[PDB]
Amino acid sequence: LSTWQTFRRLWPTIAPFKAGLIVAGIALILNAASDTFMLSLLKPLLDDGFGKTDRSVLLWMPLVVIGLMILRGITSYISSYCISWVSGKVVMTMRRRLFGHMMGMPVAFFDKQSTGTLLSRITYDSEQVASSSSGALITVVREGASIIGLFIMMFYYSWQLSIILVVLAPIVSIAIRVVSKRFRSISKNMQNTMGQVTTSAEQMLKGHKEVLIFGGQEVETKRFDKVSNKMRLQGMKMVSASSISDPIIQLIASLALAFVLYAASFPSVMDSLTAGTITVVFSSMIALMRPLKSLTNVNAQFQRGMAACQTLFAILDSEQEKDEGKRVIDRATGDLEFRNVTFTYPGREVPALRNINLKIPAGKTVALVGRSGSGKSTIASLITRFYDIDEGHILMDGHDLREYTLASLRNQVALVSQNVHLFNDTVANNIAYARTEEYSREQIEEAARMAYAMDFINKMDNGLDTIIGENGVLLSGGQRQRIAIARALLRDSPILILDEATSALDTESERAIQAALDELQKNRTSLVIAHRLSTIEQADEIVVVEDGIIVERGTHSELLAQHGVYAQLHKMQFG
Template sequence: MSSKPASFTKNPLKGWVPFWRLIRETKPSRSALAIALTLSLSSTVTALIVPLFTKNVVDSFSLSSIGVPQISLLVVAFVIQAVTAAISTYMLARVGQQVIAGLRERLWRKLLALPVTYYDNHQTGETVSRMTNDTAVVKGLITEHMTSFITGIISIMGSVAILIALDWRMTLVMLTAAPLLMLVMVPLGRKMHLVSKSMQDETAQLSGVLSQVLSEIRLVKASNAEDREFESGMKGIRNMFKLGLSEGKVQALIGPLISLIMMLMLVIIIGYGGFRVSSGALSAGDLVAFILYLFQIMMPASQIAMFFTQMQKAIGATERINETLIDTEEVLETGVVLTGANKPIVADHVRFTYESGGEPVLDGISFVIPPGKVTALVGPSGGGKTTLFSMLERFYTPTEGTIRLGEEPIDSYSLRSWRAAIGYVQQESTLMTGSVRDNIAYGTEREVSEEEIQRAASMAYADRFIDQLPNGYETEVGERGIKLSGGQRQRIGIARALLRDPSILMLDEATSSLDSESEHYVQEALRNLMKGRTTIVIAHRLSTVIDADQLLFIENGRITGRGTHAELLSSHELYRKFAEQQLQAQTVQ
């Protein structure tokens, strides 16, 4: 087990502090809470009147003693109790829903602000589980158990106060149940905390597996990997089943043990009370009132016990939520606002490793990318080209060295303005669920007109297929753009970049996986996009970057050659082999 659960067993209150702090930070409505608590108090006080009424009836029982006023008083008490209980329950449920909505808002805002490095180390499904499953546990505690906990506390305190006034000796005998309850509930609460925390972890892991498999279901089916993925999912399901059984055992013990203790107390009260009645120290009405108040203590005590078991589950969920909330996030607005990026991009002895002490992905590279020119990154796979792109987008920070725009380090500019200056077209453009129009305008911070969207689509040669779609620009593209072809997705991605009008353009060889017709249109669209912009291209095929102003040959994290195509052919042996191999491949085709 981890150190956190171990520390909890030594100090049960330790896990409650961050839980209540988290709830408090959502700023629940104090007025709604005050109204709910006031009504709960009224409802409970009204319920406490009934045993006293019964006591008087028993002590002076006769038909003449039960009249219309007494019956009316009892009916009014029941009606007031029902109405106040209903309103207070609704108010507390409303506050609970507001708390969870606020918590989910904080989490969602945080997840969008976390850097790419966070997602490198956390599965998407696990992260989604924090947003849905963990918050659902907290919601269940507040909306389903908080009401009964508050009313139960009030009911027990009121009942005990009245019982002390009636007969303090009998009350003292009854209160011996409290230490017995603590002996039962404390170890069970600790066990529930450990089990529930493991359950939340296992749920998150299973969500990660399901999310990954279902998002790549075409690969699974094409690879005949259904059986393998079924077993992968079943492993998590079996683990959750075992943890669920452990949780069920704890819950199965709580109810019967509390009932056993309470029934024991009932027997003691009846026996001891009967003795005191027979001796004249207690009236029959007092004994009846004691028994009724005991039941008003027994039911709330059971509900409070369930509240504390659910509380342990909520604490386990809260620990994971807090871990996400305290993680370092990106700050978009801090820094100088970038107003013009028509300057050279300079890398000065940049070194980068993904893990401390690990092998460097980039090992002291230096280069200058001139403004308004095309620079191509070429070389074998795994050389560090994609990592360099990520660093230019400031997804990662250099372990050593600096990247500058002109004379200023790029991290001196605000992250929002820096990324707004960059247009990125991936090897396979990713689309979001929504319409064609939504995807072209995606990420544009200003209001864009219909004419601007259509002009961008036209320059990207996307209007040629958009006009043929069933609903034109309103056509839904499906999850990740699955309803469109690769070439169509690329052209929408280029239209999106054109609409942003970036100063710096980054292309991850956007034509490498397209058929010849789609490649033709995409190449034409890219020419429109590259005009007058600082362009950096990851080249998988040398034929697409022969005319680049500068080529940087990157292998094993180092730049081993730089120059034009002709210069590298004559000076760089590995580049020459690359060029010859691709030329031979094209000749064979």
């Protein structure tokens, strides 16, 4: 209905690759001509050949057959290659645009659904877009050409007979539609009263025990004999009706045939005719049925493919992360403060955090501590503006976070976890995620040294050049952790978020990990979702979170002496 809006929108991504469409359409028209020329040459076969018993006709005829067929194959390959090339580039451009758009959507959008199955729906629907629309272009250009061809040829070789057929065919098809509809109604009326009798009969084996006790078996057999005969007689009523439809339909079309032959008896018609031209006109008229049937499904196909293009424009039209921030931080000095921070995850009520006051001074390290839920993680995600807050403020160097540009803000923070973003590349270029040409191999080796990683790197194929496979296959949890540390070390990020909740703590050479973490925290601001005793007790401040509110605050022994929830968690070792 409105799918040409969708198409007019889509078009300027295609219009760069127009040439291949031009070409494809040409080759399709050629392919249609080649078809109808092959049909056309039944006339010389039956006249110039067998009518004049001229065996020279059957000599060239083979060479025109294999000729045309060679051309038809060539035109087919050209057309399907041009079409595939254009649809491939259109889907690739649309996939790239969609991806670049999503990389820049809210994290909310990313927490509704797995990206693994969103990019599956997207690659599939983009394929179905270019598939359905190019298939419709094909069957338009080609079946339109072949229809025009067969009509021209029909009327040329015998406009009288062609006018007869063109008139008869609609009447015959409308007579058939009318008859098979009148029979669909009669079949659904009988399937209703067959469904009832069948249900009735499928019930009457129940209450078997009552029957055995009372000895009513022969009675229930005489009830089934009757319902079975009734089922079978309804089966007959249905068959005798349905097996009449198709005889009458064929007799209807046969009357049209016999009528066409009777018309061809009259010389007004017969003088234009021969064996050749009659068989050409019947062949081309039968050949018309396929491209017409194709042409009445083209609309369904085109809208089916603009329906999938609707979803991709839906995704491209949904809104990106807010970045009205106007200030650019070179390097944050460090002082970082929550001030009455209240926050609700979108699409819920019951806040996740209430009235969070909290100051992390420059150089210092706060440890967040609490049970599973708590809100530990939410605070950290609020640091990077992965969401935005309902009430209060969060300050960096005495300005709100939202006054800074998302890029500047996120350039200051770094993150360390076990589930660090590893990807198919060298170690060197993982450690320098972006900024590969901005840090030399010397610097990257120093970052890997102080992260206690050259231990296991130098014991590996090509050292720092060693590739890390599909998803980062090779590295164990503690190696992941040390790589993440090397990364946060290499960029001298003024803030550090350290997530210990995911990372595992059995790991051989946890000593090395703590030694690197120690070197990392050195004179840099660091919020820590904490579970290592080692870092909790060493923390300049601790902040205890319960049900989204800070309950306790202070140093390790200061809070332990209070025998409160911090003590409860220290006894359980956090977990």
